[PDB]
């Protein structure tokens, strides 16, 4: 079985994840990235 | 079975995730990115 | 079975996610991006 | 069985993860990256 | 069985993980990287 | 400043997120929940 | 400053995240939960 | 400064994260939980 | 300064993270939990 | 300064992290827990 057939001439995968990029001032409770969390 | 057949000449995948980009002032409770979370 | 047949000459996938881009002032409770969350 | 057949001429995988990049001031509770956590 | 067949002309895997990169001031409780943890 | 004043006698927050609940048959490309993604 | 004042008699926060709950059959490409990702 | 004042009589925080709960059959490429990733 | 003042009568924090819970059959490429990763 | 003042009558912190719990059959490439990694 062909679970996955990748046919291409060039595969480019790029991922960018920037959290809290340039902040004037963080007061109290601040979350730049919350995943399945709780406060 | 062909679960997935990718036929191309060039595959380019790029993802950009910017959270809290340039902020004047964060007061009290601030969330730049909340996923399945709770405050 | 043909789960998915991709026939092309060039596949380009680009995604941009910018949250909280340029803010005058964040007071009280502010959410630049809430997914399945609750405050 | 073909669990996964990668057919390409050049595979490039790049990932960037930056947490707490340039911050004016972090007060109280601040989370630049929360994964399955809780406060 | 073909658990995984990698067919390419050049494989490049690069990952960048920066925690607490340049911070103005961390007060109280600050987490630049939390994985399956709890405070 | 009164960024946010919560005055109540009982606060109850409950969130339920169920994806792919009861499916007769998933063929080809299927997405039970896509957030800021792309296929 | 009152960044955030929580005044209550009982705070209850509950979050439930179920992905791929009961599936008849997953063929080809299937995503039970995609966050800021790309295929 | 009152960055964050929690005034309550009982705080209860519960989070549940279940990935790939009961599956008939996972073929080809399947993702039970993708966070800032790419395939 | 009051970075964070927790005033309660009972704090209960519980987190549950289950990956790949009960699976009929995982073929090809399967990810039960992907965080800032790439395949 | 009061970086963090925890005032409660009972603090209970419990975390559960199960990877690859009960699997019918893992073929090819399978990841039950990926953190800042790459394949």
Probe site for chain E from D13, D16, D26 (most E CB atoms < 10 A)? D26
Looking at beta carbons, which residues of chain C come within 8 Å of G27?
1, 3
Alpha carbons within 13 angstroms on the beta-carbon side of residue I33 total 26
Start-to-end CA span in chain A (Å)? 46
E7 labelled ligand-binding: no
Neighbors of chain A with 3 or more C-beta pairs under 8 Å: B, D, G, H, I
CB within 8 Å of chain J, chain D residues 1-20: 1, 3-4, 13, 15, 17
* φ/ψ (deg, to 5) at H34: -120, 125
F15 known ligand binder: no
| Nearest Cα to Cα of residue A22 among J36, G28, E13, B18 | B18
Instruction: Select from A27, A31, A34 the residue whose CB has the most chain H CBs within 10 Å, as the one to mutate to test that interface.
Output: A27
> Cβ–Cβ of D1/J29 closer than 8 Å?
no
Burial of E33 (0-12, 13-18, 19+ CB in 10 A): buried
Measure Cα distances from D11 to A2, B3, I39 in Å.
20, 21, 11
Closest CA in chain G for residue H37: G37
CA distance E17 to J37: 10
Q: Which residues are paired to J15 by β-bridges? A: I15
Using the 8-state DSSP alphabet, how is residue D18 labeled?
E
Q: Among residues I1, I36, B25, which one has the least CA distance to residue E24?
A: B25
The closest of F20, C36, I18 to A35, measured between CA atoms, is C36
C-alpha–C-alpha distance, residues G37 and H21, integer Å: 21
With an 8 Å Cβ cutoff, is J28 touching chain D?
yes
Task: Tell whether residue H6 is among the known ligand binding residues.
Answer: yes
Which residues does chain C have within 8 Å of residue F3's beta carbon, measured at their own beta carbons? Answer: 27-29
- Is the Cβ pair F37, C28 closer than 8 Å? no
Q: Which DSSP string corresponds to F1-39?
A: -BS-EEE-S-EEEEEEEEES-S-S-B-SSEES-EES-B-
Burial of I20 (0-12, 13-18, 19+ CB in 10 A): buried
Residues H33, I33: Cα–Cα separation, whole Å: 5
For the record, the structure tokens of F20 come out as 């792919």
> DSSP secondary-structure letter at J11?
E
**Residues B12-31: b if buried by 16+ CB within 10 A, e if exposed:** bbbbbbbbbbebebbbbbbb
Sign of the C-alpha dihedral computed for residues F32, I36, G15 and G19 taken in this order: positive
Tokens of G33: 């939960």
Specify the DSSP element, H or E, that contains A7.
Answer: strand A5-7
Can you tell me which residue has the tokens 């399967």? I30
């Amino acid at each position: 079985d062909a679970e996955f057939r990748h046919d291409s001439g060039y595969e480019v995968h790029h991922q960018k994840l920037v959290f809290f990029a340039d902040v004037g001032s963080n007061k109290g409770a601040i979350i730049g990235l919350m995943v399945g969390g709780v406060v």
